């Protein structure tokens, strides 16, 4: 199917405790493959997946050079933005950057992304045309015409449509035993009596990749989203993911309910019932 590559940067200013902490993570779909922690001892981009370990030292040197150089720019921007809002030099502040590209099954450009945040809220983002900018407040418009005068959009678009997509293709093939595999969810149902007039049925979905999944409940073939509970999809710690959904049902009527599991690793959507 379609695939994504994302890079997440986070720079946290810590006044009185050194220079800002910079953390960079690289993702292909739902799989991290590189990371940079400026508080780690290597000061180099480190692999996080087996397939990227085969890249040569020229790869790891350029990746280390580029993102540490981004961390240096984040340091200056941290002081700049703090001045934009006239904020104290001892308060903590965070700059977050997200960017990446999407490709189709044929493996070429679908969409491109570039969004920047300050203190957890939108600052400036690259629009979908990859030629204009959308600013949240007036302080971010100062950055907008700065990036308009410097023509940052042209060179962001050049990477989003070029080097991003091209290397996403290489990663998808070099690690297809992991990235392009579709582990279907191993499912089951549990029953927990609440009282003697109500009971909880939980629909489990374990060990699936990618994380995208849909768990829904039905009663007599009719959708039931009242008295339901869905938890956030969570990592299992081994590359796969977990999720469950619950419904409170009257005692005796447990078999009127059905759980439905949709996932790209499944040929047909599964249906499970409590016997």
């Amino acid at each position: 199917g379609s695939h994504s590559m994302r890079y997440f940067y986070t720079s946290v200013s810590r006044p009185g405790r050194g220079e800002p902490r910079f953390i960079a993570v690289g993702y292909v779909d739902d799989t991290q493959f590189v990371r940079f922690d400026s508080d780690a001892a290597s000061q180099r981009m480190e692999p996080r997946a087996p397939w990227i370990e085969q890249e040569g030292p020229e790869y790891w040197d350029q990746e280390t050079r580029n993102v540490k150089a981004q961390s240096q720019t984040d340091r200056v921007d941290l002081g700049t933005l703090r001045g934009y809002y006239n904020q104290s030099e001892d308060g903590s502040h965070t700059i977050q950057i997200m960017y990446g590209c999407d490709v189709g099954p044929d493996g070429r450009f679908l969409r491109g992304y570039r969004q920047d945040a300050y203190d957890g809220k939108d600052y400036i983002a690259l629009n979908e045309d990859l030629r204009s900018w959308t600013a949240a407040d007036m302080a971010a418009q100062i950055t907008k015409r700065k990036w308009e005068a410097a023509h940052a959009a042209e060179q962001q678009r050049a990477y989003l449509e070029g080097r991003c997509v091209e290397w996403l293709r290489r990663y998808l093939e070099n690690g297809k035993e992991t990235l392009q595999r579709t582990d279907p969810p191993k499912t089951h149902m549990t029953h927990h009596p609440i009282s003697d007039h109500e009971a909880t049925l939980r629909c489990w979905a374990l060990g699936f990749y990618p994380a995208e999944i849909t768990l829904t409940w039905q009663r007599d073939g009719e959708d039931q989203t009242q008295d339901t509970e869905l938890v956030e999809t969570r990592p299992a710690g081994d590359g796969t993911f977990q999720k469950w959904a619950a419904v409170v049902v009257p005692s005796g009527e447990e078999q009127r309910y059905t759980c439905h599991v949709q996932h790209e690793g499944l040929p047909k959507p599964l249906t499970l019932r409590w016997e």
Partner: peptide, 10 residues
């Protein structure tokens, strides 16, 4: 690979 385009200041 991460964006090789070099960062314009904010």
């Amino acid at each position: 690979v991460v964006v090789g385009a070099c960062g314009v200041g904010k």
